[PDB]
Amino acid sequence: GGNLPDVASHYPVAYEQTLDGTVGFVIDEMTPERATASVEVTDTLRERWGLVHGGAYCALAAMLATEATVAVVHEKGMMAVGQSNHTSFFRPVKEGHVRAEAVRIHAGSTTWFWDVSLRDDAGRLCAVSSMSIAVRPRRD
Amino acid sequence: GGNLPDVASHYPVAYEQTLDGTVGFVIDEMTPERATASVEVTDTLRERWGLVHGGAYCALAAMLATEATVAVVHEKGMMAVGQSNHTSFFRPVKEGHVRAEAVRIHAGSTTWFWDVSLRDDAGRLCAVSSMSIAVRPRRD
Amino acid sequence: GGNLPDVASHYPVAYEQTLDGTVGFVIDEMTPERATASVEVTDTLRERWGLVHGGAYCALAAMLATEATVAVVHEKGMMAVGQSNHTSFFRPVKEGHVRAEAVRIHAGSTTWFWDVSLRDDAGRLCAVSSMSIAVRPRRD
Amino acid sequence: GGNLPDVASHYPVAYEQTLDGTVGFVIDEMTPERATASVEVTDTLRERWGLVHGGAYCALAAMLATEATVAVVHEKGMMAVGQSNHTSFFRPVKEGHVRAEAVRIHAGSTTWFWDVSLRDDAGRLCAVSSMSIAVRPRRD
Numbered sequence: 370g371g372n373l374p375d376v377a378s379h380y381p382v383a384y385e386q387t388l389d390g391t392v393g394f395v396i397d398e399m400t401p402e403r404a405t406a407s408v409e410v411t412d413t414l415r416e417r418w419g420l421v422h423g424g425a426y427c428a429l430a431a432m433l434a435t436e437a438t439v440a441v442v443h444e445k446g447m448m449a450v451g452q453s454n455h456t457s458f459f460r461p462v463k464e465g466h467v468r469a470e471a472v473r474i475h476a477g478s479t480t481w482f483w484d485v486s487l488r489d490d491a492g493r494l495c496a497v498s499s500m501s502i503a504v505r506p507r508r509d
Numbered sequence: 510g511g512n513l514p515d516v517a518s519h520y521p522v523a524y525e526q527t528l529d530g531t532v533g534f535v536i537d538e539m540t541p542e543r544a545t546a547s548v549e550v551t552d553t554l555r556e557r558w559g560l561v562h563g564g565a566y567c568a569l570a571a572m573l574a575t576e577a578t579v580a581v582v583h584e585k586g587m588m589a590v591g592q593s594n595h596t597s598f599f600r601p602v603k604e605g606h607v608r609a610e611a612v613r614i615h616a617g618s619t620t621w622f623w624d625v626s627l628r629d630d631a632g633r634l635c636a637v638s639s640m641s642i643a644v645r646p647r648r649d
Numbered sequence: 650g651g652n653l654p655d656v657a658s659h660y661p662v663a664y665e666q667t668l669d670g671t672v673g674f675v676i677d678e679m680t681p682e683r684a685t686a687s688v689e690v691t692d693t694l695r696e697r698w699g700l701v702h703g704g705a706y707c708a709l710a711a712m713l714a715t716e717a718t719v720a721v722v723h724e725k726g727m728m729a730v731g732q733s734n735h736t737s738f739f740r741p742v743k744e745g746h747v748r749a750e751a752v753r754i755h756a757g758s759t760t761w762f763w764d765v766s767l768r769d770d771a772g773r774l775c776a777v778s779s780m781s782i783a784v785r786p787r788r789d
Numbered sequence: 790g791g792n793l794p795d796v797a798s799h800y801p802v803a804y805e806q807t808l809d810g811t812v813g814f815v816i817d818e819m820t821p822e823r824a825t826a827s828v829e830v831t832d833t834l835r836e837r838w839g840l841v842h843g844g845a846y847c848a849l850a851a852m853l854a855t856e857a858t859v860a861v862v863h864e865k866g867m868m869a870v871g872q873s874n875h876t877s878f879f880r881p882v883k884e885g886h887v888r889a890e891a892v893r894i895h896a897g898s899t900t901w902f903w904d905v906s907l908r909d910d911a912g913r914l915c916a917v918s919s920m921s922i923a924v925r926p927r928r929d
């Protein structure tokens with residue numbers, strides 16, 4: 370459903386049932402250095418005051434940054450998982466879409482780093498979220 | 510509902526339709542200095558690898574921190590919204606619950622700061638999330 | 650001096666006595682959207698392991714970001730001060746120089762945000778540092 | 790001079806010559822779970838506006854958190870180095886001292902995490918700085 374990178378033959382939880390499937394995250398482009406995704410704003414994305422939830426921008430950043438790393442390292446026997454996230458909220462989003470662009474800024478052996486920009490339909494930069502992703506040898 | 514602070518006669522989005530109500534966040538205690546909330550793990554809270562989504566710890570921290578601020582400042586004519594968030598992920602959660610405790614560490618005239626601990630059912634510290642909350646005069 | 654923006658007739662501390670002058674920070678370019686600064690590595694910039702001190706990347710980012718804000722807002726009756734900083738360390742620097750480039754990404758009425766890149770003499774990205782800058786009316 | 794943990798027979802740079810020796814950082818208590826340090830404010834610690842430099846609070850946090858980790862892991866064949874820092878500035882310090890308390894919150898196999906509180910002489914919490922420290926096998 371969401372176009373997450375297909376790196377495994379099966380997954381513990383299907384897209385539609387995940388947080389990401391529930392709120393409607395969809396990945397558009399995906400390369401080792403850059404990934405983009407979007408989501409249509411609906412109440413399920415908002416908090417009680419009618420604005421997109423701060424948690425939604427973080428979740429979209431965490432998924433996109435982590436999965437962009439997974440797309441490269443999994444076939445090398447590595448697992449990749451977000452280790453830290455820092456989000457700044459510059460302006461709220463009331464409706465329309467949120468579009469995320471993840472740009473790889475450092476790729477170390479144990480940690481990758483991505484800057485994610487989150488824009489509204491007018492192209493205004495509404496939030497930024499940077500992700501540090503830990504890369505470790507798969508256990509299983 | 511989620512027991513969010515009842516400060517206004519009408520809210521733009523009903524609890525059950527918000528992201529918060531969708532994933533099942535509920536506030537337990539709330540005072541000016543400290544607040545606690547919890548959620549049952551379901552697939553809606555998970556990513557496709559079967560663990561609680563990074564976004565979920567951040568979303569919980571953000572609502573809890575911001576709303577504990579609203580609880581104080583709203584009746585004073587002020588609006589409060591998360592301005593930034595920094596989250597670090599120490600151990601995953603596969604199932605059970607996530608419990609948040611938010612401790613106010615600074616209450617400035619324009620900015621309030623909260624540290625939020627996220628623990629599993631064994632009590633282990635799985636993530637921490639710092640929230641900075643902007644406090645501004647309410648627009649009419 | 651360090652070529653900091655000349656916005657006032659008197660400053661409480663002379664360049665050469667500040668932390669900035671002590672370690673040798675110097676601003677090269679400064680515009681409303683972008684500013685650059687550099688420092689020669691000396692032992693004064695190092696920790697006891699012989700590498701550039703973590704604090705030094707943060708100090709450089711903080712002065713550069715805040716002062717690029719002062720450069721705009723001071724003549725408008727506003728004071729600007731760093732409010733938060735997030736720094737990630739990708740590679741150490743043993744010797745040579747550290748070059749900073751600060752790019753303004755949001756300019757709000759109360760908060761400005763800058764991303765600062767810190768590079769070695771080979772051009773490699775050694776650290777990044779995000780600064781949030783508070784902008785408030787100047788106290789008389 | 791600064792009471793840094795004595796874990797090696799020699800060091801690349803002597804205390805007095807380091808950033809830390811220059812500005813005057815001194816460690817008081819040091820255990821695996823908690824460390825404290827202070828520094829006397831003098832112009833060398835301040836920026837041109839007469840307030841303690843934002844970089845000074847970060848440097849004191851980075852040193853104290855990293856060195857508290859070094860104190861445990863070095864004798865186990867590990868190196869420890871700060872990997873990220875996030876600092877919030879709640880109130881400025883004009884003079885007197887800055888006192889730092891570092892509290893260990895997580896100790897993983899590859900990353901430790903410390904929260905550092907930075908107080909003035911009245912005991913007010915002026916800044917907080919959290920440090921993530923990478924722990925890796927020594928190379929040499």
Ligand SMILES: CC(C)(COP(=O)(O)OP(=O)(O)OC[C@H]1O[C@@H](n2cnc3c(N)ncnc32)[C@H](O)[C@@H]1OP(=O)(O)O)[C@@H](O)C(=O)NCCC(=O)NCCSCC(=O)c1ccc(O)cc1
Pocket residue numbers: 416417418420421422423424458459460461462513529571572575576588590591592643645646647648756757758759760761
């Ligand atoms: C944070 C801040 C208020 C700081 O203001 P600033 O940096 O000085 O920016 P500025 O004041 O230039 O205004 C930018 C925009 O912010 C909004 N804004 C600014 N000030 C105000 C205000 N006093 N009242 C209402 N909106 C404001 C407004 O949209 C403004 O655009 P415009 O109408 O002025 O063109 C502004 O950047 C902002 O509103 N950012 C977005 C906040 C946000 O989206 N937060 C997400 C976390 S919210 C917490 C959360 O997740 C949550 C979840 C559940 C729950 O129940 C409660 C909270």
Ligand SMILES: CC(C)(COP(=O)(O)OP(=O)(O)OC[C@H]1O[C@@H](n2cnc3c(N)ncnc32)[C@H](O)[C@@H]1OP(=O)(O)O)[C@@H](O)C(=O)NCCC(=O)NCCSCC(=O)c1ccc(O)cc1
Pocket residue numbers: 373431432435436448450451452503505506507508556557558560561562563564598599600601602896897898899900
């Ligand atoms: C990041 C890191 C691996 C660093 O490991 P560490 O500091 O070395 O901790 P240590 O290695 O001491 O092990 C502690 C626990 O981490 C886990 N862990 C560590 N290494 C591994 C590994 N190679 N494989 C699996 N689990 C591991 C494991 O649970 C371990 O406990 P135990 O099984 O050993 O008792 C660890 O702290 C951790 O796993 N943190 C949790 C990461 C997390 O929960 N991320 C949340 C954002 S995740 C990304 C995200 O949101 C997302 C959403 C959608 C999507 O499609 C993809 C991702």
Ligand SMILES: CC(C)(COP(=O)(O)OP(=O)(O)OC[C@H]1O[C@@H](n2cnc3c(N)ncnc32)[C@H](O)[C@@H]1OP(=O)(O)O)[C@@H](O)C(=O)NCCC(=O)NCCSCC(=O)c1ccc(O)cc1
Pocket residue numbers: 476477478479480696697698700701702703704738739740741742793851852855856868870871872923925926927928
């Ligand atoms: C944190 C980390 C080790 C993570 O490693 P990574 O993401 O796996 O990067 P990778 O492992 O891909 O290696 C990249 C570079 O890191 C360095 N590095 C990585 N592993 C090691 C290691 N085991 N031993 C020494 N250097 C290493 C090395 O320079 C390497 O390049 P190369 O020599 O391999 O060409 C690496 O990104 C790094 O070294 N970052 C710089 C850390 C830094 O500069 N810290 C600044 C705050 S440091 C703490 C501080 O301020 C302080 C002040 C006073 C005091 O008394 C003590 C500390």
Ligand SMILES: CC(C)(COP(=O)(O)OP(=O)(O)OC[C@H]1O[C@@H](n2cnc3c(N)ncnc32)[C@H](O)[C@@H]1OP(=O)(O)O)[C@@H](O)C(=O)NCCC(=O)NCCSCC(=O)c1ccc(O)cc1
Pocket residue numbers: 616617618619620621653669711712715716728730731732783785786787788836837838840841842843844878879880881882
């Ligand atoms: C950031 C902010 C202004 C936000 O205000 P707030 O969160 O609403 O807190 P609140 O307004 O309740 O006031 C707390 C204290 O802040 C100070 N403050 C607050 N507003 C103002 C103002 N408009 N004018 C002057 N001082 C103020 C004042 O000390 C106040 O105490 P009191 O006199 O009100 O008792 C306040 O928390 C603050 O001043 N924090 C400290 C800022 C700081 O120390 N920054 C360090 C980085 S500064 C950037 C830097 O490193 C640098 C280095 C070199 C260089 O050349 C330039 C910069």
